């Protein structure tokens, strides 16, 4: 009966203006960088999906701070973009590379790694930055 695909994405922006990025393992974009992101699974809530994607791709525990945006990528494709804060876990290094990601790392918002999986994350980091400024 499902007719829509919910996706989740996490923006972490530290006090030092660094963003948490993950390095993709998927063949089509292997070695490229992106935000922690993934499709919701049957049985979980959107916040549970956020936490799972962050754990799997970056190794960290987290909590959502706010919903920064909801995007209608298509009539049946919706992406929820959260500002998130780390609450524990261990940052995933390349020692732990697997199918979910090759590693995760923090980069200055203004000095991002390359190549990026997609550039749609630029705007998202700016959203976080503005939110943090407004708050
Ligand atoms: Mg992030
Ligand atoms: Mg860390
Ligand atoms: Mg305001
Ligand atoms: Na939860
Ligand atoms: Na925790
Ligand atoms: Na792009
Ligand atoms: Na993409």
Swiss-Prot record:
Mg(2+) binds at residue 20. Residues 1-129 form the Nudix hydrolase domain. A motif (Nudix box) lies at residues 38-59. Belongs to the Nudix hydrolase family. Mediates the hydrolysis of oxidized nucleoside diphosphate derivatives. Hydrolyzes 8-oxo-7,8-dihydroguanine (8-oxo-Gua)-containing deoxyribo- and ribonucleoside diphosphates to the monophosphates. Hydrolyzes 8-oxo-dGDP and 8-oxo-GDP with the same efficiencies. Also hydrolyzes 8-OH-dADP and 2-OH-dADP. Exhibited no or minimal hydrolysis activity against 8-oxo-dGTP, 8-oxo-GTP, dGTP, GTP, dGDP and GDP. Probably removes oxidized guanine nucleotides from both the DNA and RNA precursor pools. This is 8-oxo-dGDP phosphatase NUDT18. It comes from Homo sapiens. The lineage of its organism: Eukaryota, Metazoa, Chordata, Craniata, Vertebrata. The chain holds residues 39 to 173 of 323 of the full protein.
């Amino acid at each position: 009966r499902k007719n829509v695909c919910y996706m989740v994405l996490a923006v972490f922006l530290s006090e030092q203006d660094e963003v948490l990025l993950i390095q993709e393992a998927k063949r089509e974009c292997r070695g490229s960088w992106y935000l922690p992101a993934g499709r919701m699974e049957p049985g979980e809530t959107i916040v549970e999906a956020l936490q799972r994607v962050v754990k799997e791709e970056a190794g960290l525990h987290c909590e959502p701070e706010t919903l920064l945006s909801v995007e209608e990528r298509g009539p049946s494709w919706v992406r929820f973009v959260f500002l998130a804060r780390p609450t524990g876990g261990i940052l995933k290094t390349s020692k732990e590379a697997d199918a979910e990601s090759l590693q995760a790392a923090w980069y200055p918002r203004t000095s991002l790694p390359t190549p990026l999986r997609a550039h749609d994350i630029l705007h998202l980091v700016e959203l976080a930055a503005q939110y943090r400024q407004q708050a």
